[PDB]
Amino acid sequence: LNVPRKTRLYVDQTLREREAGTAMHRTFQADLYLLRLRAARAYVQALESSLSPVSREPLKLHAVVQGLGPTFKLTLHLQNTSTARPILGLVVCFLYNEVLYALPRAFFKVPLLVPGLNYPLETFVKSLSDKGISDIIKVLVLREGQSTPLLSAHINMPMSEGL
Amino acid sequence: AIVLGTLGDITSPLAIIGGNCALQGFNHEGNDLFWTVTGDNVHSLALCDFDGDGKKELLVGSEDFDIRVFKEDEIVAEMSETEIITSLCPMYGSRFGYALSNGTVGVYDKTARYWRIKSK
Amino acid sequence: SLFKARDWWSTVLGDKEEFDQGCLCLADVDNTGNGQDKIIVGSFMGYLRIFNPHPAQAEDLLLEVHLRDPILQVEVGKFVSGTEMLHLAVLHSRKLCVYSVSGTLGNVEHGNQYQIKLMYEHNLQRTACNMTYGSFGGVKGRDLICIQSVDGMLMVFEQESYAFGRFLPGSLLPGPLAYSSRTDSFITVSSCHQVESYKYQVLAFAVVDWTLNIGEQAIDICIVSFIQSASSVFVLGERNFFCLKDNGQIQFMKKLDYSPSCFLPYCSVSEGTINTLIGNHNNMLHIYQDVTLKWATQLPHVPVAVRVGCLHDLKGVIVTLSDDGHLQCSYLGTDPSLFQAPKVESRELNYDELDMELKELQKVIKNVNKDLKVSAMVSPNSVTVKVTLKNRVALQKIKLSIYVQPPLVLTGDQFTFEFMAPEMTRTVGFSVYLKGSYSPPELEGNAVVSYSRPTERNPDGIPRVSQCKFRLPLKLVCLPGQPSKTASHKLTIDTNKSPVSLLSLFPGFAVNVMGFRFLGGSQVTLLASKTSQRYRIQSEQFEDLWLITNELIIRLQEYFEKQGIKDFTCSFSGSVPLEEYFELIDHHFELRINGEKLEELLSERAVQFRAIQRRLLTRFKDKTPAPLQHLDTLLDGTYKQVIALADAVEENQDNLFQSFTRLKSATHLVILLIGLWQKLSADQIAILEAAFLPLQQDTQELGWEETVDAALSHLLKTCLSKSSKEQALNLNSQLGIPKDTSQLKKHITLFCDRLAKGGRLCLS
Amino acid sequence: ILDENAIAQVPRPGTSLKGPSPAVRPVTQAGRPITGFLRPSTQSGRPGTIEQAIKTPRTAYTARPIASSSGPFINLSRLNLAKYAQKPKLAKALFEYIFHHENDVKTALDLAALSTEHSQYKDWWWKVQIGKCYYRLGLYREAEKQFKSALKQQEMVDTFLYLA
Amino acid sequence: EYHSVHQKLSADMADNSNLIRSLLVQAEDARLMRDMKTMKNRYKELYDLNKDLLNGYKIRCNNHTELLGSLKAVNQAIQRAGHLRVGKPKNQVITACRDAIRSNNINMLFRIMRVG
């Protein structure tokens, strides 16, 4: 068989574990407690800013960028993830730096999202800076009666390769 | 026009070549070991032991309608054919078969033609 | 501790002073004769300091004298004409000074003083750069000094006075100078990458003994000679590390991957080899056995001019001196230390506060799993709209945009506001006007603000979005025109009231039979009733009916509201059109199919162009001349084809956009007539508006046909069907461009049918 | 894609550039398991068509996002390279400036050619620099010639890696 | 000078060929997103670059054929010098002239062609 082989490192490590197992157990439990703390912290901060592209109220969105050159094709793949329930009133709003990117329609309604179909909703981003400047673009999907985004996404726009 | 063989008093199979008016030679690494100048554009080369001494001289067919035989450094003889040579082939001792652009296919001993036939 | 340079007597050496190479010297300037060396450091700030370190402490610093002019390349050698005792040389930019550190003792550790006497000096005409010292020629017991210049010249002093001076042939930036004794040669590295050795007696007679073109210019050159078996010359470039023979060729070389700053081939171990140690600009020392790394250490500072010496009974201590002012004697750290978590029984995890915070965060998590006012006002008159927004809390990064429709054009789109104090109003004003021929699908427009709330959790502010929609008037797109008696098609709206004068419903257009002409030529006729109670809308274009029908119903509602009466209908009992509506769909889909064909043809044309272009590039890269074989002609033909196809695709895109707008108007009218033809409430009308009006622009991945077809198939699947066989056979939904529009039309007719029998829409 | 230089089109498996299974080691392409020590020379597979290369993530075939093509101290159009070529002490630093700071391969090659003809083709450094100019102009064989001729002058690790 | 001109022309044509490959990629990109203004601009730039590169090809080929003529003249001159002498002096003169031209010692070339 291909049963592996363990060197002196393994027996020294097992001897350390056999002689100092209690301290390892205690410190790993402390580290796990601190990790749960920090993960809950970051999860709550993300819920606050609503920066999760995956978040009752079922949705899933991710934005793909395609193309070099001053004009990029930005396609938002959006999807309703539910057994059988459509989502009527939703709308997408883009947040960009109006001095670097020229978005024609930075806000538009989305079609009735049928559960199970990936809707590609695309736009044409265009770099305006004569010098190569890469700035982030935010996308917020939100109801039409609410003001807090249902979910969000980020895209680091690549360099322009302009003229 | 290029060939590949052993010249006279050279212990490495050379890749002889023929260009505007100058031949060359390269070993397995590409070092110039043989170089000489001829009359006009070389059109055909072959390796035949004219002279029976065990080291093959090379036969050059110039665009000047001539067929010269070159040793490692020295020229031995030249027979004046009647058109731009196009192909030489040795398989005998000192006999080589030649072609022209007239259509003439023939055979040479040392310095004379056994036969010759001209066609379309 | 492994691979660190563990600390010995260490210090900082001034107030933002600056040193260089040659500064750090290490020998017996005290001439004790015991072997223990003494550190000597002189900056070009002026201070010359000498230390006798002991393993911080006060009495370590022997002396800290200050000379006026800067100090370059302190050295220690037999620089006096008479005796064989070491003297200390100080080279100022335009000065040479030999000293003598004489230390007299008192009856206490700190009662001993040290006197430096200026044995002699030398005024330097040229500006000195660096120097070397050695027994030039074959002299013994003397240490002559060859100083360089910043402009190339090298001047030699025979330990007493100005012996001579010769210019270096062809140098601009002076490099490192050294003197080899096994060959009696001055070796330098000129600006032109040439390591050059000159025989001494050759320069004395003024040429090059030999040269070697290394790949770069060298930072240092250190000829080491404690081995009399095989002599060598070390040259440290700024990218490589050479060890050269004595004839002039590389004995070996290392291609360093870091940036060296200093090196010192110290005492060797094996037979023939030479240990050396080099200092990165990455704060490390490397210890090679001439090519091969034997050890490496992580220094504290960027080493400049390292040395190795016996300091207080410990041989081979490494003394480093940074250029900022640090200095440190050190010994290698050879203690592999267990990687293990520290046992700190005292330090415990505070479970109380941590559990409080975790309970708070987990409460937020398990809870979530179960500020600005905008207003728009349109002027009564290219109508000028004014949007006022007012905040309650202080807001930041406000962006206001306006979206009306494709045909309508705005004179201003985006407006950016920065931070605003609470209870502050902001007004913007733009103008909207029709630009084109076809009338927009609807006159309503939207205006959206995206702002941010700065919060403690995220100061950058959580982003929020709020919108308001304004309603534009007919006076922007229409005009009163002549009416016609008959048109291609017409529809009716039968209210349960009296026929109202069209002058009262539409006062802007000055009988009970009105005619309208939109900017674009198209005309609509509105006929009130005389005997019946129904209004008739007629035109040739099904699109044209929508705007006038919507406005008629809205004005009827408003008027009959002003009269205070509460019961009012717009029944339209009859036949939903469904046939002049399908022709627009078919026109749209024919344009879509034509576009796909044009694009798949453009693909082939582009492939041809690329192939011919690659052929031409191959002909270009080739040396030999050759006929183009009319490849350029094929390229020109293909280019013409590509341009023609590109123009065709552009025109098809424009036609498709016009058809999409007209189809949007038609489907608006059809949803209106379905919501009237049956008593549809606002919920089902919203469902229909969501299903039939999905997008305002076709794209090469999602179009109107597939989207409305999926929506209608689903609406019939979950609400209006009870047989599973049809649900799985006909009522399926996909998002790919169809090959025919028959399924969409079948589903629309079936929707109207199953609504007629008494069906009703839902979501779940 | 648009540049073909390999002689053999379908060479034997094992002689061309163009372990643990994907059940253990994460992968980046169909094969090519993830590596340690990303270097800016990593290709890690190659796309088949321009469309596939465009419609994929920009950093899926290189350590950096792909590109279509791979006051001022001194104005390059003002100096006569035929006069700085006579002075090698100036010419070497000037060429390094033009090549590594300004990235002007054509003027750099002009200067390097004039310099090499001034040195009668006897210094390996100018040969290596001309070879580098060629190599980033696209001409590989014309660069291999200079690198070979520089190896003949004086063996250096630099020229060996350049030929590699 | 023929050598130098050919070198400069090959450099320039390599530059323009790299430009053309970049423009091919950019045009394919603009066409994949049906952006026809930028695609047509890439195609215009490609047309112009092809015109310039064809001019460059014509001039290079012309200089290159002249260079071949010059090389044949040199080689035929060495051969004409050698052919004037019978026997062992022939290859002596041939190799001497070849070494006198590989070192660009033209005066020695003519010296060995005159008497040597």
Essential attributes:
5 chains, A: 163 residues, alpha+beta, 4-stranded antiparallel beta sheet, 3-stranded antiparallel beta sheet, 2 helices, 25% helix, D: 164 residues, mainly alpha, 7 helices, 44% helix, Tetratricopeptide repeat domain 8 (chain D)
Count of separate DSSP helical elements of chain C: 10
Shape of chain C: elongated
* Proportion of residues in β-strands of chain A: 25-35%
Which class of secondary structure composition applies to the elements of chain C? alpha+beta
- The residue fraction in helices of chain C comes out at 10-25%
Radius of gyration of chain C, rounded?
Answer: 47 Å
Give the distance, in angstroms, between the N- and C-terminal Cα atoms of chain A: 62 Å
| Largest pleated sheet of chain A | 4 strands, antiparallel
Number of domains of chain C: 4
Strands ordered across the widest β-sheet of chain A = 4-3-6-7
**Strand content bin of chain C:** 25-35%
| Ends distance of chain C | 68 Å
Tell me roughly what share of residues is in helical segments of chain A. Answer: 25-40%
Q: Strand order, biggest sheet of chain C?
A: 39-41-42-43-40
PDB class: protein transport
Keywords: protein transport
Entry title: Cryo-EM structure of apo-BBSome
Chain A: BBS1 domain-containing protein
Characterise this structure.
The structure is cut from a larger assembly and holds 1 copy of chain A (163 residues), 2 copies of chain B, 1 copy of chain C (764 residues) and 1 copy of chain D (164 residues). Chain B is 0% helix and 47% strand. By secondary structure, chain B is an all-beta fold. Chain C is of the alpha+beta class and 764 residues long. Chain C folds into 4 domains: 1-336, no CATH class; 371-477, no CATH class; 478-571, no CATH class; 572-764, no CATH class. Chain D has 164 residues and is mainly α. Chain D is 44% helix and 0% strand. Chains in contact: A-C, A-D, A-E, B-E, C-D, C-E, D-E. Chains B and E meet through strand 3 of B and helix 2 and helix 3 of E. Chain D: It comes from Bos taurus. Chain D: This is Tetratricopeptide repeat domain 8.
Question: TL;DR?
Answer:
This is part of a larger assembly, with 1 copy of chain A (163 residues), 2 copies of chain B, 1 copy of chain C (764 residues) and 1 copy of chain D (164 residues). Chain B is mainly beta and 120 residues long. Helices cover 0% and strands 47% of the residues of chain B.
